[PDB]
Each structure stands twice: as structure tokens, then as C-alpha cells.
């Protein structure tokens, strides 16, 4: 029953069966590398990948720095037997952890079932293996045997934390996206992981740790395994499909390459950035590709290169693609079976869903970028278990994701140098000197991934404006934990394809990795001259670096940006002079006690309101914290919110384009009562679909263009609060170390207590801030986006009402007996709006509970 049914040690002797030196497809001539077959169809090679790609042979940092927020290099990693033993055991342990969830059991079983198609022949009656979907397995005597293979885990290339799914291409076939599939090579390391900031789960866990949390490498591996799943079933989305961004404005990223394949694979909100028109186009495309597989199987008459029979190989692919087969042996694609398989491969197998099964903390969107690299070691059971990961049951690490908190669980995480420098990729934002008073420009560098995601309009498409033909026939059209259990129940575990004998290939298998779209470097260091302080200036103003003297808080953004010993606070002037005052030893602890009170009072303030649609609270200090709406005061912010609504938060106003909706053309059947009536009912049903489509489109637009903005403001509000805590800490601490080491011995001061209290107050603040910003997001949706939709939908309703009433009149002869009933039906149905229910379009119990 375990996925890995054998203990593997790197120094174990070879047997040519599941422990062996192997050769994989290679462009030149690769040396055999020791590998381990940890499960049918799945191998692990504990080596750095200097093999799959001829250019990437050097393990040193590149000439030009890679355009990613976090990268890590060490040419010595994974060069020793002990490291390779630890790698192997870590990967093996992560497979069992994935397998130990229902979802992973399914995914891993789909992967094993998803053998690359036998489309190696050019004759359309012959099945034949494709060479590059195989390996050569060296025997203990020095001979070799060739074997088919679905998946290989290998060590990373130069950039140790660049994890990706690679695959050998074909001169004619695009195997990863034509339904065929190909053997997948995942660059991965269990020995490092990413660190990220999270502040959302603070309402459920008010005791959430300060600082960075570590990504569970099981989530990371599951992510790459999802990719490998898509690619094995040959339904990956071409990487030339990218969600392109606007990069011109001062507040926008300089560049961002995120593929549709990645959005799909993440799941959650990210997957919904892709509109319905593109979504359905994909599904239809892959459906036809599966149909081609069924058809080539139907005309297959022979098989070469194996003793395995034709009926056996056909069945292997009937099973992989869940084809139907009639009693004469003719294979076909069933629309319903395809839809379920495609839905499972792309919507059930997602990172988001894996995070639910693991019950770990994780970035909620790709836009919450990784911020650090950590060294880890998950092999020792005292560090990490198959069932609990880092969050070990019956310990203090069990709750609040404490095991993933790199500060609380610091022995498990060593923070490493990010080889992407802080301002390697940046924009230079300058408040024009005259604005500040002439006096110099106030220029700061802003890291690329601290800027805003502004999706290009071209990412969003629709055929709302197209008309359609209503017919008597016309066809009338969520992922829950229960649904996943229902899909789970269709799985037969135990039943896998055999490892069959194939004829030996060449000693060297010639292979080239799938041709990838070349990507341009972003422009870097672009300079902007601005007529205001930005959020970014207000945030930078709250920072400090290493220094010898006492930091002082100031309420002037300007002063703080000009003086390394001065830090901007949005707290009250009273707070400013209290923290800044010289404080004698005998009053130290009461002074600390008061500052914590004050810090808490200021950060937990909430104003209630009855004057803004769908916004019942306001956090007033958000105004001066980030200069929201370019109004430097709390009073300015509160009033500006009530006046203009949620828009003042936005860095940019989204385009929301709903065109005149296409008109329904009704077909007349002038000799048939039933058909005429069905046509009228169909028109009504299609109308109901139209509201749904319009709403769904607007939700997609809102999530990608508006909600992402509020998300970043939320992240930055947390950074601001942390900045305030750190500054207050540094000052309190400076004041302490001014005392005699006799005063200090009496005042047994523990800065850890201070940090813990301030973190708690930051969590409580973030609870309010998150509720507030949630309300703002939904309120903007409800009051500034959806109404454009409903107006267009009401125009359409009115137009449709006229058409249907005319249709009934023109067919009153045919509709003898029913004219008046059909009028009521049409009039009643098209008189009142279809209410928008957010829960129909998103399953975030967070944004849902706001609605």
C-alpha cells in the first residue's frame, strides 16, 4: 500500500531493476548516472541536471542575473554520496506524503497510468514507441536493457531553486500539447524551500507567527507533479500563452511572465484569471486531440518493437484516455467522460487543492511572491513527518502553522543569500523636488516584485456581443471536497500498466528538450518623475538600516527619507514624543508597558460607518500609512472613502467593457407546436445563461484587475505594521543599553517578550485590516463593476422580451391554445433581474462571508 514500497539508500548495490546506472535522452553523449526506480514508471536521479540541456552544464551563477525574485546558486550542492542519499530519502518521503492524501493518491495514479502515446511510427497503421520516452538501464554485468518511463525526478540545474518540468521534444509532434504525452523530467530539490509572508489566516489563528513562513516542499513537488500530469496526457497549455502585463506606468511591474499553464496549475483565484471563452476553446481543442488518439487506435493494425500485443497496447491507451469501446472494438471519445477527465486533470489536480489536503499554510496566489530561500532537512523524523510535515502533532508546532514559521521553528530553517539582489530589478521613483517644497528629488528604488500587477486588456476576451441562433434543440448547459471523494471512488488502485519488454535502443538515446519560446529581458532601472509621494515612498520612509545612533520616529515622510536615523510613523504625535523621550532606568518597564498599549490602541482602531455601500468599517490610519488617495491625514481618508467609495484605494481604475449583448434569433417551426414552444423555453434558458456568463466574466475581470490591487495594499499594510514594530523595538532596546549593567541586571529585560506582544497586536490589526479591505474589494465589485453588466443584461432582457412576444404573435396560429400562457412566462421571466450571488462564482469563504 505505501507508494515507495522499499527502503532506498544511495550506496545500495545496483541490480539493474530498481537500482541502476541509467542513460536518458541526451543531445550529445551522456555518462550513465545512478538512479532509483521508486515506483513503477518513476525514477529518481540524485544528480544536478547538467545533462538534459547542453547549454546548462555550468553550475555557476549566470552572466546576466535571471529575472526572478528569488534565486540560489552553489556548484557544490549535491556532489557527495551523503547529500545524494539525503536527496533520495527526501524525495521518497515527499512522494509518500503526497500519496498519503486522497488527492495525491489520485494524481500519482493518473501519472503512472499516463504512459506517453505510441505514436513513433509514420505509417498510420502502426503503433511504435517514441525513443525519447525511454531510458537505458545498465545491468550489473555491464549490458543494458531499454525501458519505458513516465517520470524522472532529478536535481536542479545552476539555479538550485528553479523547479520545473522538462521534456524531450519531437521533430514533428508537440507531445506535451497534442494529447500524446511524453516522459517528464522534474528539476526539484527537497533540500531547500521558499519563504513567504502571509497575513490572511490571522482571524482563525490570532497567534500566527511573525516573519516568514516556509513553503512545504510537498506542495512544491505536488505543483510540478501537476505539470507533469498535464504533459503526460499531452494537454499542457503552450507556454506562448502568457498573461501579459502593462509595464509602462510608475506603479506597475517592469515585467512578469506567468503562463496560462501555471495559472491553471495553481488553481484557486489564479485559475479564474482566464475567461470562459479561452477556457472553452482549450477544452474543445484537447477533446479533438483525444479524438485523434481514438482514431489512430481504430486504424492501428500492427505494433513493432515489443512482444506485447496490439490489443494490449490499445487497451493501455483506452485506459489512459478513458476511451469508450463498442462491442466491435471501435474506440471513441465520450463527451461526458472527457469532460470529467479534463476537469480532474486541470481543476481537481491544483496546488490550491493540495494545500487543503495537506492543511498547511501557503501563498494564496502566485502574486504573493516568494521572498527568501531556506536550507532545510526533512529526512529526520524530528523535523518533518509524512502526515504532519513540519507541523508536528502533539507539539507546539502542531497549531498555527508554527512548524512552518521560520522564526519559531528556526532550527529547521537556515536563511540563505538570495542571489537576486534587492534592487537588481527595479524602478526608480522620484518625487519631484519642488513637490517636497528646488530641493533635490526624492528618489527611491523599488524592487520589481513590490510593484503592481496590471493585466493587459488583451488577456480578457468575450463573445458577449455575438448573436446566436435559438433552436428547438438548443443545448442547455463546483469543485467540492465531496466531489473529489466521488472522483476518488472511480479509481482502481493496484491496476497499473505493466513494465513490458521493448527492443533495445541505441546505446546513446538522442534527445533535444522541447523548443521553448524565447523571452525578452524587461527594461530595468526606468526612472519616473512624479508629482506626489507614492505608497512606495511612504513605505520606504518607515524603514531603517544598521546604525550606531538612536532612531527617532517622525511624522514627516520627507524627514525620514532624508535621514537614516529618522523613521516615519503614521502613529500620533503623542506616540512620537513618548517613544523618542529619554527614559531613565526606574521608569523603563512602565515605559515599555505604555508603548505596547499605545501601539495596540493605534493599530487596532476601527471606525464603523453606515454611509458606504457594502463597507461597514473603516481603518483610518491606512490613509497616512500608505498615503492612500494622496491625502496625508486620517480625517482626509475617512471622508474620502465615504465620498468616493472603494475607488480611492485603487492604483488604477480597471477597464470593464461589456458591449451591447448579441441578439437572439429564434428559428420558426411553422408546422409544429412542440418545437415552437421548446424554442421559446430555450430562449429563456439561454437568457439565464447570459446573465451567468456576464457575471462570471466580470468576476474574472474583478479578481485579476481589482482584487489583486487590494491584496497588495494588504501585504503593504502588514509591512508597514512590521516596520513600526521593528522601529519601536530598536528604540526601546537602544534606551535599555544606555543603562548601567547593574540597572540592567535588576531590570531583567527580555526583548523577546516585547516582540511577541507587538506581533500579537500586529495580528489583531491585520484582522481588522483584512475585514476592511475585503469589504472594499467586494464593494467595488458590487457598485462599480457589476452595474455595467446588469444594465447591459437589462437592455438585453428588454430586447429579448420584444422578440419573444413578437415570435409568439407571428406563430399564434401554431401556438393555438397557449398564446396567453407563453406571454406570462416570457413577461414574468424577463421582468426581474437574476440576482448576483458571489458564491456561485468563487469559493473563497473569506470574500463570500463579506458578500
Amino acid at each position, epitope marked *: 500500500m505505501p507508494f515507495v514500497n522499499k527502503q532506498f539508500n544511495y550506496k545500495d548495490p545496483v541490480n539493474g531493476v530498481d537500482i541502476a546506472y541509467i542513460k536518458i535522452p541526451n543531445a550529445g553523449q551522456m555518462q550513465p548516472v545512478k538512479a532509483f526506480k521508486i515506483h513503477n514508471k518513476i525514477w529518481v536521479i540524485p544528480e544536478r541536471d547538467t545533462f538534459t540541456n547542453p547549454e546548462e552544464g555550468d553550475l555557476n551563477p549566470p552572466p546576466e542575473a535571471k529575472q526572478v525574485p528569488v534565486s540560489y546558486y552553489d556548484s557544490t550542492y549535491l556532489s557527495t554520496d551523503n547529500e545524494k542519499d539525503n536527496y533520495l530519502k527526501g524525495v521518497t518521503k515527499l512522494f509518500e506524503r503526497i500519496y498519503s492524501t486522497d488527492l495525491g493518491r489520485m494524481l500519482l495514479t493518473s501519472i503512472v497510468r499516463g504512459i506517453p502515446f505510441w505514436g513513433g511510427s*509514420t505509417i498510420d497503421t502502426e503503433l511504435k514507441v517514441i525513443d525519447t520516452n525511454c531510458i537505458n538501464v545498465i545491468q550489473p554485468d555491464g549490458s543494458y536493457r531499454s525501458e519505458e518511463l513516465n517520470l524522472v525526478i532529478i536535481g536542479p540545474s545552476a539555479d538550485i531553486i528553479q523547479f520545473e518540468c522538462k521534456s524531450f521534444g519531437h521533430e514533428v509532434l508537440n507531445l506535451t500539447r497534442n494529447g500524446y504525452g511524453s516522459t517528464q523530467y522534474i528539476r526539484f530539490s527537497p533540500d531547500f524551500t521558499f519563504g513567504f509572508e502571509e497575513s490572511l489566516e490571522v482571524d482563525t489563528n490570532p497567534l500566527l507567527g511573525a516573519g516568514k513562513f516556509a513553503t512545504d516542499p510537498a506542495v512544491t513537488l505536488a505543483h510540478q507533479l501537476i505539470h507533469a500530469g498535464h504533459r503526460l496526457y499531452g494537454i499542457a497549455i503552450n507556454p506562448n500563452r502568457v498573461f501579459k502585463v502593462n509595464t509602462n506606468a510608475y506603479y506597475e511591474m517592469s515585467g512578469l511572465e506567468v503562463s496560462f499553464e501555471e495559472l491553471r496549475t495553481f488553481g484557486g483565484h489564479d485559475a479564474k484569471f482566464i475567461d470562459s471563452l479561452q477556457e472553452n476553446e482549450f477544452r474543445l481543442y484537447y477533446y479533438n486531440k483525444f479524438k485523434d488518439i481514438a482514431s489512430t487506435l481504430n486504424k492501428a493494425k500492427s505494433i513493432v518493437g515489443t512482444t506485447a500485443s496490439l490489443q494490449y497496447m490499445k487497451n493501455v491507451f483506452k485506459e489512459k484516455y478513458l476511451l469508450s469501446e463498442d462491442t466491435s472494438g471501435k474506440f471513441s471519445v465520450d463527451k461526458l467522460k472527457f469532460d470529467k477527465l479534463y476537469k480532474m486533470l486541470t481543476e481537481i489536480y491544483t496546488e490550491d487543492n493540495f494545500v487543503k489536503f495537506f492543511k498547511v499554510l501557503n501563498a494564496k496566489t502566485f502574486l504573493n511572491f516568494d521572498k527568501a530561500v531556506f536550507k532545510i532537512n526533512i529526512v529526520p523524523k524530528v523535523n518533518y513527518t509524512i502526515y504532519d510535515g513540519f507541523n508536528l502533532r502533539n507539539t507546539n508546532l502542531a497549531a498555527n502553522f508554527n512548524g512552518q514559521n521560520t522564526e519559531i521553528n528556526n532550527m529547521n530553517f537556515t536563511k540563505l543569500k538570495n542571489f537576486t539582489g534587492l534592487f537588481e530589478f527595479y524602478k526608480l521613483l522620484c518625487v519631484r523636488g519642488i513637490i517636497t517644497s528646488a530641493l533635490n528629488d526624492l528618489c527611491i528604488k523599488v524592487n520589481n516584485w513590490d510593484l503592481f500587477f496590471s493585466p493587459s486588456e488583451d488577456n480578457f476576451t468575450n463573445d458577449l456581443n455575438k448573436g446566436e441562433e435559438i433552436t428547438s434543440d438548443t443545448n442547455i448547459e463546483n469543485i467540492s471536497l465531496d466531489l473529489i471523494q466521488q472522483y476518488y471512488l472511480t479509481f482502481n488502485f493496484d491496476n497499473e500498466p505493466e513494465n513490458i519488454s521493448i527492443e533495445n535502443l541505441s546505446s546513446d538515446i538522442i534527445g533535444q528538450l522541447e523548443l521553448m519560446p524565447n523571452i525578452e529581458r524587461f527594461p530595468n532601472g526606468k526612472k519616473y518623475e512624479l508629482d506626489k509621494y507614492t505608497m512606495f515612498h511612504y513605505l520606504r520612509a518607515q524603514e531603517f538600516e544598521h546604525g550606531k545612533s538612536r532612531i527617532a520616529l517622525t511624522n514627516s515622510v520627507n524627514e525620514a527619507l532624508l535621514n537614516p536615523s529618522r523613521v516615519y510613523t503614521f502613529f500620533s504625535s503623542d506616540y512620537v514624543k513618548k517613544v523618542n523621550k529619554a527614559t531613565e532606568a526606574a521608569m523603563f518597564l512602565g515605559w515599555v508597558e505604555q508603548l505596547v498599549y499605545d501601539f495596540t490602541d493605534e493599530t487596532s482602531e476601527v471606525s464603523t460607518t453606515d454611509k458606504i455601500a457594502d463597507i461597514t468599517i473603516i481603518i483610518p490610519y491606512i490613509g497616512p500609512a500608505l498615503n492612500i488617495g494622496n491625502m496625508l491625514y486620517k480625517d482626509d481618508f475617512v471622508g474620502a472613502l465615504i465620498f468616493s467609495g472603494a475607488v480611492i484605494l485603487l492604483e488604477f481604475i480597471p477597464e470593464i467593457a461589456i458591449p451591447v449583448l448579441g441578439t437572439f434569433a429564434l428559428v420558426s417551426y411553422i408546422a409544429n407546436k412542440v418545437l415552437t414552444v421548446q424554442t421559446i423555453d430555450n430562449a429563456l434558458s439561454k437568457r439565464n445563461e447570459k446573465w451567468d456568463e456576464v457575471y462570471k466574466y466580470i468576476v474574472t475581470n474583478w479578481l485579476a484587475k481589482v482584487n489583486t490591487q487590494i491584496d497588495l495594499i494588504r501585504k503593504k499594510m502588514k509591512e508597514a505594521l512590521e516596520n513600526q514594530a521593528e522601529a519601536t523595538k530598536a528604540i526601546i532596546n537602544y534606551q535599555y543599553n544606555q543603562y548601567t549593567e547593574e540597572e540592567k541586571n535588576n531590570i531583567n529585560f527580555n526583548i523577546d517578550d516585547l516582540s511577541s506582544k507587538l506581533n500579537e497586536s500586529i495580528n489583531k490589526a491585520m484582522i481588522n485590516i483584512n475585514k476592511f479591505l475585503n469589504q472594499c474589494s467586494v464593494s467595488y465589485l458590487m457598485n462599480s463593476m457589476i452595474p455595467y453588466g446588469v444594465k447591459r443584461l437589462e437592455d438585453f432582457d428588454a430586447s429579448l422580451k420584444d422578440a419573444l412576444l413578437k415570435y409568439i404573435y407571428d406563430n399564434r396560429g401554431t401556438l393555438i391554445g397557449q398564446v396567453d400562457r407563453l406571454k406570462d412566462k416570457v413577461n414574468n421571466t424577463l421582468s426581474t433581474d437574476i440576482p448576483f450571488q458571489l458564491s456561485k462564482y468563487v469559493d473563497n469563504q473569506r470574500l463570500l462571508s463579506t458578500f
Partner: nanobody
Amino acid sequence: QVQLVESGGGLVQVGGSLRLSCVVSGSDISGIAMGWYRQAPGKRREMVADIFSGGSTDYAGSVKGRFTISRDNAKKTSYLQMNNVKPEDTGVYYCRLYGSGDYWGQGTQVTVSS
């Protein structure tokens, strides 16, 4: 009902250029991928180029750089531009609409001659 009608097609001299066209009737093309396939005698039909509704394309490796696929949603048309044709390009070409049906053109011979 849905019909794909191709036009154009060889004879064509080695190294030469040629365009195949196809017009779709009975459906709207918008939101639906299209592609061109070819089939030489005795050999399996193979995708040559794909083009999705928003203009993004895909090619068989051995025609990339020589062939260009295009489409016009308002006109419900696709075309395949073929440059620097080789003897390996000889065969019967089909346009396809990737909808919910089997939507193919009749097939048009392209013959590359030295």
C-alpha cells in the same frame, strides 16, 4: 450545418511558395481553435499548424519558420502560407475547426516538384 471549404494547392516548385485557404460556413469560428493537417500516402495524418482564436499559434517543428498559419474571425477564414517548400511537404492538406464535432475540409493535394 458546418462546412469547411478549402481552396489553393500545388503543383509547386521546390523552394516555392503557396497559400491554402479555407472558409467555414454554418458556425462562427470565434472562440474556437483551427489548424492545418497533412497526410502523405501510406502515412499518418499530422498536425502542421494550429491557431487559436486570439491569434496565438503552434507549428510542427519541421515546418516552423517556413509555414505561417493565419485566421480571420469576421470572415470565418483560415489560411496556411507555405514558404520554401520541400519534397517532405508533398501530401493532402486539411483544414480543421476544433469545435464540438468532426469539422474538416475536403483535403487539397499539394505536390512539390523538382
